[PDB]
Design a protein around this ligand. Structure first.
Ligand SMILES: OC[C@H]1O[C@@H](O[C@H]2[C@H](O)[C@@H](O)[C@@H](O)O[C@@H]2CO)[C@H](O)[C@@H](O)[C@H]1O
Ligand SMILES: Nc1ccn([C@@H]2O[C@H](COP(=O)(O)O)[C@@H](O)[C@H]2O)c(=O)n1
Length: 378
């Protein structure tokens, strides 16, 4: 019948893996594709090369009703090939299942490919440390079953629910950390349950594409020549990475802005706690959703070369353009960065789930961790 490919992600890391999927499968100009990537604008010159190509907005972590207008265009039996954010998988598939409900006879779910949002999945798993994971799976399995038959979301364990899709669909997980599932002893039943339905995110994907596909991908992720040449400088490089807050609260937005500027100053100034040297070129790699937090850095910093916030950090590792050193606020980008390039990771005590994930992984050592409120105003 007809296979329809849906690419869905309100965040960054899954959309990045999914655009690699699109690249590897881009010889096919007619395969039906729906792009719900909040953080990614397919270039119009590329859009015109394709047909059966669609775009849907996401709101509240899920495709809007406009998804239905698009699917209505394929009146035959359709099998949906779905790519999702793991943390948001339940919401993202919500409207698809509501469409399926109305068109049971002709609409099926072929397969799921799922990708980590990032650290969030691991932070949340860390909170599941003192629970019977075995029992939790079997309960989530049952509750997923009720979701698929009523369309109603009710989960006793919303975290573990994100990993029981194989009880209903052919599934593949792509993990930022397969080492997490191995080292976290409490999660062994999960690891075993997932069996061979998971792999690690493959960062070597880009070097195995053809030159034409490589340029194609860089055009998807917004990685222009200007940025390429800005990083090829004949000098040692430090990239300062920013963060963002998921709180529209103005006072908090400005606080993050103020603290992050102060953090940079600890890195780049002589009097700083994290002073790196005088012999580094300084770059700002802002969070893609930083917004006014990113603006605050640019407006208030000096001798700083901006790498536009929209380019994901991992693209620099695709293209072998990693700097000498990287420091900043704890980020999903630190999970896949070679350990030799970590200057310092800062967290926004002993029982911080995020500190624990990164301690478990070897990303930060037995080191007395650095919170950003623990730093003097320079
Ligand atoms: O919406 C994309 C981002 O979601 C963030 O998670 C939010 C969530 O969307 C919101 O509804 C509420 O639950 O707060 C969460 C953060 O605690 C993710 O953190 C981010 O990675 C994106 O997926
Ligand atoms: N400063 C930053 C922060 C995040 N990012 C991208 O966004 C993703 C999610 O990062 P966070 O965990 O910081 O939200 C990362 O994997 C990275 O691709 C970035 O490219 N530069």
């Amino acid at each position: 019948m007809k296979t329809i490919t849906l690419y869905l992600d309100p965040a960054s890391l899954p959309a990045l893996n999914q655009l690699m999927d699109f690249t590897q499968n881009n010889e096919d100009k007619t395969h039906p594709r729906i792009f719900g990537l909040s953080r990614f604008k397919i270039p119009d010159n590329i859009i015109t090369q394709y047909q059966n190509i669609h775009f849907v907005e996401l709101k509240d972590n899920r495709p809007t009703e406009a998804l239905f207008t698009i699917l209505d265009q394929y009146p035959g039996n359709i099998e949906l090939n779905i790519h999702l954010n793991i943390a948001h998988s339940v919401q993202l598939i919500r409207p698809i299942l509501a469409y399926r409900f109305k068109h049971l006879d002709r609409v099926s779910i072929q397969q799921l490919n799922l990708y980590d949002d990032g650290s969030m999945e691991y932070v949340d798993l860390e909170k599941e440390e003192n629970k019977d994971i075995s029992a939790e799976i079997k309960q989530a399995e049952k509750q997923l079953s009720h979701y698929l038959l009523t369309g109603k979301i009710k989960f006793d364990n919303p975290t573990i629910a994100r990993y029981v899709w194989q009880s209903a669909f052919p599934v593949k997980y792509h993990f930022l950390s397969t080492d997490y599932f191995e080292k976290a002893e409490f999660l062994q039943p999960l690891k075993e349950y997932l069996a061979e339905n998971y792999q690690k995110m493959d960062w070597t994907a880009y070097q195995q594409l053809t030159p034409e596909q490589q340029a194609f991908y860089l055009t998807l992720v917004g990685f222009n020549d200007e940025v390429k040449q800005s990083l090829e400088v004949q000098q040692a490089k430090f990239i300062f990475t920013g963060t963002t807050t998921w709180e529209g609260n103005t006072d908090v937005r400005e606080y993050y802005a103020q603290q992050q500027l102060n953090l940079l100053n600890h890195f780049t100034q002589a009097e700083g706690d994290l002073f790196i040297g005088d012999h580094y070129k300084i770059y700002f790699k802002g969070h893609p959703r930083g917004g006014e937090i990113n603006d605050y850095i640019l407006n208030n910093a000096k001798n700083i070369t901006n790498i536009p916030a929209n380019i994901s950090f991992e693209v620099l590792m695709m293209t072998g353009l990693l700097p000498d050193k990287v420091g900043g606020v704890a980020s999903s980008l630190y999970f896949s960065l070679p350990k030799e390039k970590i200057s310092h990771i800062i967290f926004t005590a002993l029982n911080n789930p995020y500190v624990k994930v990164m301690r478990r992984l070897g990303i930060i050592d037995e080191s007395q961790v650095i919170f950003w409120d623990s730093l003097k105003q320079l």
